[PDB]
C-alpha cells in the first residue's frame, strides 16, 4: 500500500499542468517508509484542504451545464483553460453540448469547441 499507487488528476489544463510537472520530478523522492499522505504533501509540495470546506456549497464546484454535483455520481471534472471562467463541467453534459455545435471538430476521441460561458478553446477527451 505504501508503494506508489497509480494516480492522475481531474481538472484544468493550467492547474493540473504544473501539478504533474512537480510529481514527475519528486516521485523519485517517494520514500515508501512514510505515510502516503505525508509522502504526497512533499512530492506534490502542497497541503490539502483537509476537509477545509468539505460538503458546503459555495456554488464553485458545479457543472454549469446541468448546474448539479454528482450527476449520476459524475463529478464536475472538465473545466476551462481560462483564468476568468474556471467554469467546471461534467463529461456527459459538455459532450452532448459540443456534439451539435458546428465548430465542434472531432479527432480520434477528442471534441474541441468553445467553452459555453466564455467562448474560449476547450478540449474534451472521452
Amino acid at each position: 500500500p505504501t508503494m506508489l499507487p497509480e494516480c492522475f488528476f481531474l481538472g484544468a489544463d493550467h492547474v493540473v499542468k504544473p501539478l504533474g510537472i512537480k510529481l514527475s520530478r519528486n516521485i523519485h523522492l517517494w520514500d515508501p517508509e512514510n505515510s502516503v499522505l505525508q509522502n504526497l504533501k512533499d512530492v506534490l509540495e502542497i497541503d490539502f484542504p483537509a476537509r477545509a470546506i468539505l460538503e458546503k456549497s459555495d456554488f464553485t464546484m458545479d457543472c454549469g451545464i446541468c448546474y448539479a454535483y454528482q450527476l449520476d455520481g459524475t463529478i464536475p471534472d472538465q473545466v476551462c483553460d481560462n483564468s476568468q471562467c474556471g467554469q467546471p463541467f461534467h463529461q456527459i453534459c459538455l459532450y452532448e453540448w459540443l456534439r451539435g455545435l458546428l465548430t465542434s471538430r472531432q479527432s480520434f476521441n477528442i471534441i474541441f469547441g468553445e467553452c459555453p460561458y466564455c467562448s474560449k478553446p476547450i478540449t474534451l477527451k472521452m
Binding site: 454549469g64 451545464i65 453534459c93 453540448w97 451539435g100 455545435l101 458546428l102 459555453p116 460561458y117
Partner: peptide, 11 residues
C-alpha cells in the same frame, strides 16, 4: 434560436 442562426448556450 440555436447556433449561428441564434446565440443559445447554457450560460
Amino acid at each position: 434560436k440555436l447556433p449561428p442562426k441564434g446565440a443559445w448556450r447554457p450560460s
